Amino acid sequence: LTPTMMLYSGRSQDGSHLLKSGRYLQQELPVRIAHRIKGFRSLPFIIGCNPTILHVHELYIRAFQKLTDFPPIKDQADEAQYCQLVRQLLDDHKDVVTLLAEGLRESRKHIEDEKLVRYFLDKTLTSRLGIRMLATHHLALHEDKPDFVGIICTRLSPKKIIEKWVDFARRLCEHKYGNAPRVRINGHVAARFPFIPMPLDYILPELLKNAMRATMESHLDTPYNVPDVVITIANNDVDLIIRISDRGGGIAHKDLDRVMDYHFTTAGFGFGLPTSRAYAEYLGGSLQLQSLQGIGTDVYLRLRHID
Amino acid sequence: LTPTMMLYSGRSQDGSHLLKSGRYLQQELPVRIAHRIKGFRSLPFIIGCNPTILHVHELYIRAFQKLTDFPPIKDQADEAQYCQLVRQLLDDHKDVVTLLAEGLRESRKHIEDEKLVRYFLDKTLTSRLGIRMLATHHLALHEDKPDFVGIICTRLSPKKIIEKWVDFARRLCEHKYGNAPRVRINGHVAARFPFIPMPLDYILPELLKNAMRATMESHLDTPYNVPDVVITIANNDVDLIIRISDRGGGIAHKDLDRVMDYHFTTAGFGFGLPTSRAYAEYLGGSLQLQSLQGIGTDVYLRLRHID
Numbered sequence: 001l002t003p004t005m006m007l008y009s010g011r012s013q014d015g016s017h018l019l020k021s022g023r024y025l026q027q028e029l030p031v032r033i034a035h036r037i038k039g040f041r042s043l044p045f046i047i048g049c050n051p052t053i054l055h056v057h058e059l060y061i062r063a064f065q066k067l068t069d070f071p072p073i074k075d076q077a078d079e080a081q082y083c084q085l086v087r088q089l090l091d092d093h094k095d096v097v098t099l100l101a102e103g104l105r106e107s108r109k110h111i112e113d114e115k116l117v118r119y120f121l122d123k124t125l126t127s128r129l130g131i132r133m134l135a136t137h138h139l140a141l142h143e144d145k146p147d148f149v150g151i152i153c154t155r156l157s158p159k160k161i162i163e164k165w166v167d168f169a170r171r172l173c174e175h176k177y178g179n180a181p182r183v184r185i186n187g188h189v190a191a192r193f194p195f196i197p198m199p200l201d202y203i204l205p206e207l208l209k210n211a212m213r214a215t216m217e218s219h220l221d222t223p224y225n226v227p228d229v230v231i232t233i234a235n236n237d238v239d240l241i242i243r244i245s246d247r248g249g250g251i252a253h254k255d256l257d258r259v260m261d262y263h264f265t266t267a268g269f270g271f272g273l274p275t276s277r278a279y280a281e282y283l284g285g286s287l288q289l290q291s292l293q294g295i296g297t298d299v300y301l302r303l304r305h306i307d
Numbered sequence: 308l309t310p311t312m313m314l315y316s317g318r319s320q321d322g323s324h325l326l327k328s329g330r331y332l333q334q335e336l337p338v339r340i341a342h343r344i345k346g347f348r349s350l351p352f353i354i355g356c357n358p359t360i361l362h363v364h365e366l367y368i369r370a371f372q373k374l375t376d377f378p379p380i381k382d383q384a385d386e387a388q389y390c391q392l393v394r395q396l397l398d399d400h401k402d403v404v405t406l407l408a409e410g411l412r413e414s415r416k417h418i419e420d421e422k423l424v425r426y427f428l429d430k431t432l433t434s435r436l437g438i439r440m441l442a443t444h445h446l447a448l449h450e451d452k453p454d455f456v457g458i459i460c461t462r463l464s465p466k467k468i469i470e471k472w473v474d475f476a477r478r479l480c481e482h483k484y485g486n487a488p489r490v491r492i493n494g495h496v497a498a499r500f501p502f503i504p505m506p507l508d509y510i511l512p513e514l515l516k517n518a519m520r521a522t523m524e525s526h527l528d529t530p531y532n533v534p535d536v537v538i539t540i541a542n543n544d545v546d547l548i549i550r551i552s553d554r555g556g557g558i559a560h561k562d563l564d565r566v567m568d569y570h571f572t573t574a575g576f577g578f579g580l581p582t583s584r585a586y587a588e589y590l591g592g593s594l595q596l597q598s599l600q601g602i603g604t605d606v607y608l609r610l611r612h613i614d
């Protein structure tokens with residue numbers, strides 16, 4: 001399970017579990033989308049009038065209409081068509097973070113309660129993650145993948161998923177700078193346990209891109225020889241901790257109280273850190289920074305295990 | 308300068324700076340000791356009645372009496388005798404932390420506001436540190452040491468002072484376990500800057516003893532081969548950061564919210580962490596912990612530079 005939301009682990013050769021899951025989504029999705037729409041309705045007028053914000057507001061209204069127009073699921077044929085709707089919505093909404101980032105960029109500067117936008121984005125993006133997790137889990141229940149129950153991996157290796165995003169981040173970095181730091185991984189490198197990959201897929205590349213950028217920009221004279229990024233995995237009975245340590249110079253004292261703000265960037269829209277922290281906390285984890293100004297930064301991602 | 312307190316850097320071949328410093332102490336010390344006595348008077352009755360607490364309470368009353376009985380300093384002869392008094396008090400009060408630790412151990416368990424004892428100890432021990440710093444600075448103004456203005460070092464090497472306490476902590480550890488982790492020091496190893504050693508002399512051995520203990524107790528099967536403790540020095544224009552990282556297994560989740568409490572220990576009286584944090588914060592710095600349960604702990608000491 002996740003916040004106020006359960007990921008069904010059920011199984012059935014008759015397929016009765018798919019119907020129960022689908023009926024659950026049918027009950028749950030319209031209510032959560034309605035909460036998002038209320039979020040839009042309460043946005044400060046001048047922000048809500050932004051055409052890009054209006055577009056996203058309308059997307060959610062359409063989603064609500066489609067979800068509520070769909071008849072109650074009674075058989076596999078109904079459930080099958082519901083999945084088509086769910087797939088369409090997942091796709092129609094895939095650029096929502098980007099659209100909100102852009103819609104909010106300028107319009108936020110008007111109102112003076114800066115807490116409002118942070119609150120709306122935390123609430124909106126985490127609810128969205130939860131919705132996409134539930135929806136994707138349902139679809140995945142149809143899949144035949146070993147080591148997976150829906151989107152839940154029954155034996156996830158933290159080292160493997162980290163290496164996947166390391167390779168991705170390294171490619172982006174090389175394309176921009178001509179090279180990328182090597183990454184070393186230490187600690188509980190052989191750990192395997194049940195876990196939902198999706199949050200890691202969102203968070204890890206954000207933290208890795210940050211570490212690599214900082215490392216390259218502080219070693220412009222020696223791009224062919226930069227300090228490794230060092231990742232430590234700690235696996236205990238309560239949580240999984242992933243520490244990502246770089247020698248990229250640290251986060252400056254003058255920037256320290258701003259790096260967690262949406263739209264703050266020293267370079268994207270400056271979303272990597274605030275979104276990653278909102279997601280971690282939404283799931284009962286946390287994201288903490290330790291800056292060693294002049295040396296580097298340690299970032300600690302903590303995510304709870306599955307009970 | 309330090310909190311509401313200035314360490315005089317003055318100089319004079321006539322020695323007029325010693326008189327000005329001494330008169331400053333004469334003004335300042337009785338007032339601060341009076342505040343400590345008020346602290347004792349406000350302690351919960353049942354704690355204040357403890358014979359060891361009463362003994363310390365009386366020590367401070369005697370100090371106040373001696374300080375206020377001393378006539379106004381007018382010449383070098385007066386100043387010279389005042390230093391004798393200051394030396395006597397520094398010596399008479401050298402075991403105060405220990406006496407308070409013991410006096411408070413049981414008696415604190417009676418009252419239910421646990422915040423009270425923490426507050427009294429933070430306030431009492433930091434004020435005491437400040438007093439001992441001011442007093443020792445004054446005495447040291449008579450000394451002829453190169454690279455020192457009183458207790459202020461004009462070119463302190465963080466690496467050197469760390470190595471001094473490493474050797475000390477390693478000896479204690481070897482005596483208890485038969486071996487000690489090696490310590491590596493990296494980062495700004497060649498840094499030198501004006502700094503007051505005294506807080507580092509209090510804090511560093513406390514953090515090093517913790518790291519070494521944890522390392523030895525988690526490697527009982529291989530005491531002859533344990534993970535190094537790794538210390539990173541970061542020196543910037545705002546602060547000095549010293550990170551002490553061990554592979555001693557971490558601080559358990561169940562203990563995490565208690566390790567900063569006076570008297571909490573899994574083994575002294577459990578004072579190393581709460582005192583070290585109070586001292587750091589008293590000076591405008593901080594002490595932060597990052598636990599990787601199952602792996603180790605990172606401890607970050609931050610102390611502000613001298614303006």
Ligand SMILES: Nc1ncnc2c1ncn2[C@@H]1O[C@H](COP(=O)(O)OP(=O)(O)NP(=O)(O)O)[C@@H](O)[C@H]1O
Nearest residue numbers: 210211214250259265266268269270271272273297
């Ligand atoms: N490991 C790091 N070292 C140094 N600076 C960092 C580090 N991580 C983040 N920062 C700084 O923190 C700022 C904000 O980070 P972030 O929220 O991820 O947005 P961004 O990287 O600038 N753009 P985005 O692609 O949206 O994530 C960065 O722009 C940097 O100035």
Ligand SMILES: Nc1ncnc2c1ncn2[C@@H]1O[C@H](COP(=O)(O)OP(=O)(O)NP(=O)(O)O)[C@@H](O)[C@H]1O
Nearest residue numbers: 517518521557566572573575576577578579580604
């Ligand atoms: N680096 C560490 N790794 C694991 N546990 C630690 C570490 N540092 C502190 N602790 C734990 O934190 C507790 C409290 O620390 P502390 O305040 O320094 O008191 P103490 O070491 O037990 N006794 P004292 O000699 O008075 O300092 C310890 O007893 C340990 O259980």
Ligand SMILES: O=C(O)[C@@H](Cl)Cc1ccccc1
Nearest residue numbers: 063089090093096128131135
């Ligand atoms: O904004 C999104 O990505 C989500 Cl909330 C769109 C969606 C709604 C309902 C079901 C699946 C996806």
Ligand SMILES: O=C(O)[C@@H](Cl)Cc1ccccc1
Nearest residue numbers: 370396397400403435438442
């Ligand atoms: O408790 C202490 O160590 C200090 Cl406050 C005693 C003292 C008082 C005054 C001057 C010097 C030392």
Ligand SMILES: [K+]
Nearest residue numbers: 259261264270
């Ligand atoms: K940001």
Ligand SMILES: [K+]
Nearest residue numbers: 566568571577
């Ligand atoms: K303690």
Ligand SMILES: [Mg+2]
Nearest residue numbers: 206210272273
């Ligand atoms: Mg980023």
Ligand SMILES: [Mg+2]
Nearest residue numbers: 513517579580
């Ligand atoms: Mg200790």
